[PDB]
Design a protein around this ligand. Sequence first.
Ligand SMILES: Nc1ncnc2c1ncn2[C@@H]1O[C@H](COP(=O)(O)OP(=O)(O)OP(=O)(O)O)[C@@H](O)[C@H]1O
Ligand SMILES: Nc1ncnc2c1ncn2[C@@H]1O[C@H](COP(=O)(O)OP(=O)(O)OP(=O)(O)O)[C@@H](O)[C@H]1O
Ligand SMILES: Nc1ncnc2c1ncn2[C@@H]1O[C@H](COP(=O)(O)OP(=O)(O)OP(=O)(O)O)[C@@H](O)[C@H]1O
Ligand SMILES: Nc1ncnc2c1ncn2[C@@H]1O[C@H](COP(=O)(O)OP(=O)(O)O)[C@@H](O)[C@H]1O
Ligand SMILES: [Mg+2]
Ligand SMILES: [Mg+2]
Ligand SMILES: [Mg+2]
Ligand SMILES: [Mg+2]
Ligand SMILES: [Zn+2]
Ligand SMILES: [Zn+2]
Lengths: 456, 374, 97, 280, 641
Amino acid sequence: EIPELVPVGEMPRNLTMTCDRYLTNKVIPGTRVTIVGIYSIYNSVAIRTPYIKILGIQSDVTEEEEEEFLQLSRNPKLYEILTNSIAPSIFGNEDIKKAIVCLLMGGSKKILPDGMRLRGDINVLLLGDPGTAKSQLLKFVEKVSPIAVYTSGKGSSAAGLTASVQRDPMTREFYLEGGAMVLADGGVVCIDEFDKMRDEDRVAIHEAMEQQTISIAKAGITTVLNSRTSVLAAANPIYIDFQTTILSRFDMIFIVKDDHNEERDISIANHVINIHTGQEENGSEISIEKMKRYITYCRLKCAPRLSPQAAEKLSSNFVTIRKQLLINELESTERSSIPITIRQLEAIIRITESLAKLELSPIAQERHVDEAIRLFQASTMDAASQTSLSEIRRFEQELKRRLPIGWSTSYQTLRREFVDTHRFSQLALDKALYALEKHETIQLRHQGQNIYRSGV
Amino acid sequence: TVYPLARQMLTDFDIRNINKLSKKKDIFDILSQSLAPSIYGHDHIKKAILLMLMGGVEKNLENGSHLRGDINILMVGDPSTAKSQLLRFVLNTASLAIATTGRGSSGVGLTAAVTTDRETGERRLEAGAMVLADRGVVCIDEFDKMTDVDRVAIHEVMEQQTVTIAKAGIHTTLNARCSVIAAANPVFGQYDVNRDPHQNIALPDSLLSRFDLLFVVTDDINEIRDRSISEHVLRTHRYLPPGYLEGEPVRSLAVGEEDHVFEKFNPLLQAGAKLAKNKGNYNGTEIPKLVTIPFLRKYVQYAKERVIPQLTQEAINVIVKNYTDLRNDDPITARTLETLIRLATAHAKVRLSKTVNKVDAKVAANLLRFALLG
Amino acid sequence: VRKDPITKEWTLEGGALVLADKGVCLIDEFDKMNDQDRTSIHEAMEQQSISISKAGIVTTLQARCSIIAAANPNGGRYNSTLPLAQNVSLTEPILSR
Amino acid sequence: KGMRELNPNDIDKLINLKGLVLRSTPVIPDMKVAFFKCNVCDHTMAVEIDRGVIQEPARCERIDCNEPNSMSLIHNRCSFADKQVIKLQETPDFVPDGQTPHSISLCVYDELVDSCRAGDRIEVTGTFRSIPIRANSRQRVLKSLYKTYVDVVHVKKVITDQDLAKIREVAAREDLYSLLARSIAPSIYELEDVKKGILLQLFGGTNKTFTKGGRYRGDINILLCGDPSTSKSQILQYVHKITPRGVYTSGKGSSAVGLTAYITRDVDTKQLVLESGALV
Amino acid sequence: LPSIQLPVDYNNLFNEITDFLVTFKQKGPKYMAMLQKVANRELNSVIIDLDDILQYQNEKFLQGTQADDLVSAIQQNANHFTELFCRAIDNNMPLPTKEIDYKDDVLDVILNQRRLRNERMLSDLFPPNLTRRYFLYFKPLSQNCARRYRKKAISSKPLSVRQIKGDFLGQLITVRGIITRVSDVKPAVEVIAYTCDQCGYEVFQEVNSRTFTPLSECTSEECSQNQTKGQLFMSTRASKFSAFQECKIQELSQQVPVGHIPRSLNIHVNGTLVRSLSPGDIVDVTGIFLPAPYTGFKALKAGLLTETYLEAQFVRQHKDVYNRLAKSIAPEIYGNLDVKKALLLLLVGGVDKRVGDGMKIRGDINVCLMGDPGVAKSQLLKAICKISPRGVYTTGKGSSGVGLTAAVMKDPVTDEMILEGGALVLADNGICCIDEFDKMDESDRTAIHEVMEQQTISISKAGINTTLNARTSILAAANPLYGRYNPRLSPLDNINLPAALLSRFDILFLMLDIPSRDDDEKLAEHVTYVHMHNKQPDLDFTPVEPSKMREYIAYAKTKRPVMSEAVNDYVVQAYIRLRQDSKREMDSKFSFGQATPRTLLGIIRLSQALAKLRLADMVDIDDVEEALRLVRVSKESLYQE
DNA sequence: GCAGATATCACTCAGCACGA
DNA sequence: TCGTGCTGAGTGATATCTGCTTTGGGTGGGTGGGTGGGTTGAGGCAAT
Ligand SMILES: Nc1ncnc2c1ncn2[C@@H]1O[C@H](COP(=O)(O)OP(=O)(O)OP(=O)(O)O)[C@@H](O)[C@H]1O
Ligand SMILES: Nc1ncnc2c1ncn2[C@@H]1O[C@H](COP(=O)(O)OP(=O)(O)OP(=O)(O)O)[C@@H](O)[C@H]1O
Ligand SMILES: Nc1ncnc2c1ncn2[C@@H]1O[C@H](COP(=O)(O)OP(=O)(O)OP(=O)(O)O)[C@@H](O)[C@H]1O
Ligand SMILES: Nc1ncnc2c1ncn2[C@@H]1O[C@H](COP(=O)(O)OP(=O)(O)O)[C@@H](O)[C@H]1O
Ligand SMILES: [Mg+2]
Ligand SMILES: [Mg+2]
Ligand SMILES: [Mg+2]
Ligand SMILES: [Mg+2]
Ligand SMILES: [Zn+2]
Ligand SMILES: [Zn+2]
């Protein structure tokens, strides 16, 4: 039954239905339908099980719409209107808006005859402090996309995402049931609260996005499923479990920080008050229905590819980025963390194709190149950038010297000795402790509240 | 009927071809750089990987003692140094391989472990990755993500070369003779030169000691190298599925059943292989005599199944002298002696000779010296 | 989840939050709850809906209720000098909500 | 004979077994003499049972009344006997190569019922019987494989005035304290005070039943703490042998629950039961 | 039932079989003598060797009187020739020569009374299998015999459970595999005997299937002429039974194709072959591959699929002394002569365990090998631990999940707390073999004291309050986690083992690896000569053979020496000197080897070990002085350096 | 095809009255 | 005083008939097979 008609405090009721011949394979789960049929009863004290015999299906789901869409694509500010339609109710965060648009459109698929087919989908990471409308952005992304799944990381588990091997009760045979990603194949999965999700589920997601084919083929069966999907991740601030490796897997990293400008604060206050007290749609925005059909059309029809001049320009851009770090490393002994990685290079590509597909442009021109360069620079380089190892060396030496073999001291006591004394920051405490524990020289006890040495 | 959708039977002239290549007194470089020709640099790693692939003679003493004769290699380095690419290439060129990553190896476990049904409780010994690579190779990935259970299992597996299960009323012994190649990123995300490799990795000396050779590789930034890598990676993206309007929505006949040996130069694929013969000189235009992978597999097959080199006095004087020089002069352990003999026999197998000669011992000693001191 | 004695098909019960839709959900000794239970209420606090996946009965339930919680500060007393962050063990998100 | 040496040749012959009791079923009533009452004339007769079969009558035995098939069994007036089924596990020594020890079922009737408890070593003499197993409940069909069991006829669980006259003689000995302290632990040398303290624990204090309050128990607790190599564990084992009941619990090999009691469930009865810990 | 004309004649084959049992001669005829032995109740199993049949056939053909190929007939259909051979034996059975008892013969009184009654009734029987008291088995055709006479052997050719297909049903074949399950001997009824309460006549019913229907009404001619409705009642005292066992055989690891799982084949054993198969054993079993037709309603609903099994017929089983037996602990290892002597003493397990009025003294010589990585410890450990008939090599963590001593785990299926023993118990009556002794957890760190002191593990956890019996001597080793040892620092400053644990060890060795040109030169040369020729470089002594050394160790462990007052005086004086010496060494904090009565008992144990190696019974001053040197050289060289 | 519970029909026996 | 032919009555054997599953659960198994079906949740205890 429809969610609206469910009385408060009650539960949705289900009804079995049957269709034959040319009425089969006409609907899929999650589609609103209108049914005309016979309400009959079949024997399974003197009760009978009701069911419906379908006679007609009319689900809410030509050339005229093609002409309308083509005329829309001819608008000279299509990119701006599309970026405006993304979360009309949330102020600021324009870069995140553009990144979400790119994610919605996605990147063109790549396949090679040898067997190494490159990824085309796009994933984004939103990592900012509370009260930033990340969840609202994720909700809007879920609603707008034709196929989308909104999942809370902590609410679900490894079974919820990727896939889990279960057993069929009726037949008692081990089978495979897909997770959120499987149900999101060909669409977008909006994962919220990336932090609270368990580490095992995080590595499962790592594999799923790495190969887009959840490989659970064992335990009585050897079946595999495809998980071609785009992941939008919103994570609470780190203040390592959130190691920079998983961040490197993400194409784009965003650190949202509202600046304390009186003008900005008054502007946001006015926007929210206008929301509470409250629609151009005349050349500056488009409703969810039109945008959804637009996304379907552009994803199914156009798969543009970059241009030779654009390719050379992007190669020169990466060269200039490496030279930019070369300029940055004015330090003589200190070493720069990373200018860029090759995975980040691949990330820079496949967003230009997203812009090309947005405008139905068969070949991406230099405009897309510069737009992508600016978008990446405004998100990842600064966030990555947003001595210490030598300090960790001294901290480790002091910890080893302080504790003999077999002697245990409280972790809080060590924090008081060093962190409170300010000789070493807290971020240098957990890192050194993890490095020491991973080598078995130290042991964590009482949920890490007591430190016990376990050898040289 | 059912229509389906290892080893290549050597012919009479294939043996002649392999002998012809063996006689050429440069074949070691050719074989080493034929594998993974795309990768720039890391030539010593390719040499060591081929040596591992061909292994060394295994000795079975009358006392039942079993002297290990299979080399092991561990890679540790900063991100983006083609570690996964090297693993893929050894997987493709190796007769047997299982890329069971060390991080929660869902599917096939790293080591054997009995299992029971939820309701019926049907006990059964499920073989892991190590057991499923007898007389072969296992290419572990992300060795730094292993859990204590896997570490304890692997220590015993490598030390003893066999697994004895004594759980759930099941008592059995399963051979695990194989070779292990693994990659492990540092603990802080970047390799620190000031620290020892045993510090940049966080495994106990017990695990690291089993690996015969340890290689430390760092990502260095050179302008010309950056341009080369960038262009090589870019080429593929513009490369297309030829068949339909270039860059658009992308989509056996029977069951019963000399460019063949050498490889024509390809700038797209080989690339750095030319730099290899140029000895790090980009300007050098020395087209190398690379060999196709299909024939290289035949070469390794023939060498591994027909040659049993025996140590010789001439190589043995230099083995003893080099080991003594290493130990007493610029912690080196007596087990490094085993490495010298193992690699000497492995290299002698490349030269298609039944006796280990001074050249094999000297080259193995040089490779070990590089693997120890930069 | 229960099993229907008539149809023998698994049904799904209502929870504490569900039973109090369009009402109030009072929680006492809030700080004493475990982390998992305290996460179970994060969804109802802001999302106003609870998602369930058991026995192949995947569905979403409506939970639009106000929550009044009572707790005592960590350590047994409120040190007026220190801020509210250290006084109570609840995480910053829930405190903001 | 051993539990692993009983062959078909030894069926229906008197054998001797020894093993460890594993589990015994509750008392089972076994019919001996049946009781029949005529529904018409209310005439009562008792008939015997042979080989587990009731020699039922076709018609009333009276002459005046001969109505056929009018006899009914009065369940609560038939004579009954006692039956119990025990499971015996062979001694661990007999196990050849460390496998799961075999088990043999036993049947005991009348006096021998409730004679052996669970977890006891017994020697049983009985007849090694064999009996068919029905393939299904609703047919006379039988399986070809016969069930083997033992019909027990004897069970052996493995003060006189003269002794009292003898015991009273020792008490008169002036050096009784030294004699007992020296005999409790013959091997231990020059620990007379420790031995004396240990001995007084075996005897124990005096028991007092006390209303208007609580019972007072005369139980003595002794701690033996000292240098390692001294005979501490040896005395522990020596006393452990003498006492009729006791558990040799160690350090780090016992748990808080393990010492007192463990809450569990009985699979056979499907009820919540509790086990006895080391202290209990 | 349409009929076919098969090219096999059973009358001729039966005649040939009858001639075979009375003419063959590998002393009179072999099988005639075998039957004569059976008639005297001395043998209860006649084994027909198909090699003999082949020899007889070839002998007949050579003479020109060619006959049918009996060997091929037997293998193609074996279930039928058992009956033929049994019938031939019954027909040609000889009269007994040795006076038989005939006293307690139930099926002799029954038959005599049955003959008397039948004769009296007729004047005015029993099935043949009932009287049989022998079992007939077939021995496969050995490959040597087949190649000798130019024939191919199908029965003896070993197969695997994978290759046993439906085409082989009803033939005599051999299967190679490992037994993985055995069942208790149970009596399978062959001929049931009933008694009529009216006639006094006995009725015998043959059962040749997995199920049977008991008889109810008497079928005797007495119950027929009188038409009495007598009731038949089963009598197990007169029936016939045969021992029955059901086992499982599984494929070896060398027969499973890649990507496939091992298969199992059921085996049925009847007659005297019972108890010849035990779990965990590699065998070559020859039997008849037969199906097991279903009965009753199950037949209709089961379908045409047939459950098969193997009827076992034959089973084949796949099977200065001190210095010399010391340098042979691991000939490959070069140095560490005194250490090898200590390991030999451990192997002998020298003790004469003494139990008086209850006191028990441990009889196990525990030893530890500390040092730095590189010295040959693990190789020594595995060699010494393979030498013994029983051994268990494990890390300090333990045998998989369960750690060393023992642990109680919740049952995955029954949800019942079950105690599973660890590494120590698996080494009962043997030497446990521990490497990485440092990595023990707290539980084992504390519970290893129990085993070392008293040979038993005691657990009083939730549901289990029993004690595990573990009479195992312990050999342990450990190494620094990161680098080399630092002799200047205390031994406890480099490893996690507590001070108390190291005290209990009888002999403690600190092995050091000090770089040096001369030493490393010889070490490399020795390892090199071994790698070249697989034997020792030095020819001054010949390494003792492995099996002979194991025999010597067993013989030595059999002996039990004793002490005397003369040597007792020496031992007590030495113990006095050792105690006095420690009065001054107590200043060092690492002096956990401080002399205690345990040291006296260890000296006695080592002396008895040396006496055992000499195979003598009386321990002499020489053994005690040698043992005192091994306790001295093990602390002095490993405490002062 | 097989065992068990159930109801159908046919055959033979002890009483009865008359006639010998 | 008595002998025998006719009758009603009641078992014995035999004719048709239904049924041949049945059942939730791991001391019923997986060579009996999934078209015969089995879809928890709190509380206690060892490991640490
Ligand atoms: N520019 C903005 N316009 C409107 N709402 C905004 C804006 N920035 C933040 N918000 C706030 O975002 C809220 C919804 O998003 P929410 O704060 O839950 O995201 P979040 O920061 O991811 O949450 P949390 O970090 O607590 O899990 C709204 O109540 C809202 O007013
Ligand atoms: N020598 C090289 N020549 C060419 N390309 C190289 C070379 N070294 C690294 N690369 C590039 O590095 C890219 C990243 O490779 P890969 O993802 O396997 O890195 P990795 O270091 O093994 O990763 P991780 O840090 O995630 O463990 C590859 O696309 C390859 O093109
Ligand atoms: N005296 C020796 N003779 C022969 N080989 C030796 C000798 N000393 C050392 N070696 C060699 O030293 C190598 C050391 O490896 P090994 O397996 O013995 O490790 P280990 O350091 O003893 O072990 P662990 O520290 O894990 O207990 C072995 O190959 C052994 O052959
Ligand atoms: N006074 C003594 N009498 C008899 N035996 C002794 C004496 N002192 C020491 N011992 C011997 O020394 C050993 C001490 O071991 P043990 O009793 O286990 O010490 P603990 O239990 O205190 O660790 C015993 O085996 C015992 O034979
Ligand atoms: Mg949120
Ligand atoms: Mg990588
Ligand atoms: Mg003690
Ligand atoms: Mg070791
Ligand atoms: Zn009556
Ligand atoms: Zn009869």
